[PDB]
DNA sequence: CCGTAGGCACGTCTGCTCGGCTCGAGTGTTCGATCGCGACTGAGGACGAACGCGCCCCCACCCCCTTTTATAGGCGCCCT
C-alpha cells in the first residue's frame, strides 16, 4: 500500500467526510437550474441518512441562505455574495484516492 | 340571522447559542543507560646480585746427589 487507510473517528477520517460533504453539496447548486441556486434539505439527508440535520446546517451557512416556505417542503437558496467554486477546485478538494 | 373571514393558539421545523465532554499538543520531571576515567592485575622484559664453575698456582711427596764395604759376571776403553 501507498496510501495510507486512517482509523475510525480520527481526525483525518472526520475531516474527509466533512469535505466530502461539502464536495457532494456543492454539486447540488451546480445541478440545481432555479436563479438564484437552490437546494432542498430532504436530497442531502437522502443521501446521508447517517448525519444529523445539525451536521448538514454546520456546511450549508457559510454558503446559503434559509427561505421558508409554507409547506413541508423548504429550500436552501444560495447567497448572490458567495462564489460557487468550480469544478477543478471541487476536484482538488477531495481525490478519488481518498474516499 | 346566518355565513364567512380573521385572529389566536398550538404543532412542527429549523436556526442559533450555550454548555459539556473529549482529544490532542506541549512541557516538565524522573529514571535508566552509556560513556569516561581510574584502578587493579597480568605478562613480559630488563637489570642487579649472588652463586657456582673454571683456571691457575701452590704445596706435598718421593727420589737423586755420595760413601763404604765385602763380593763376582759381563761390557767397554787405553796404552803396551
Known amino acids: ?3 495510507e487507510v486512517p482509523g475510525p473517528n480520527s481526525k483525518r477520517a472526520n475531516t474527509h467526510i ?3 460533504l461539502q464536495v457532494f453539496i456543492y454539486r447540488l447548486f451546480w445541478k440545481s437550474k432555479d436563479r438564484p441556486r ?3 434539505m430532504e436530497d ?12 448538514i446546517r454546520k456546511r450549508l451557512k457559510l454558503c ?13 437558496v444560495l447567497k448572490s455574495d458567495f462564489r460557487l ?15
Open 44 to 55: 442531502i439527508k437522502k443521501a446521508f441518512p447517517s448525519h444529523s440535520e445539525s451536521s
Open 1 to 3: 500500500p501507498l496510501f
Open 38 to 40: 437552490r437546494i432542498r
Open 64 to 76: 446559503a441562505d434559509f427561505k421558508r416556505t409554507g409547506m413541508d417542503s423548504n429550500w436552501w
Open 18 to 20: 466533512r469535505d466530502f
Open 85 to 99: 467554486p468550480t469544478e477543478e477546485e471541487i476536484r482538488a478538494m477531495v481525490s478519488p484516492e481518498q474516499c
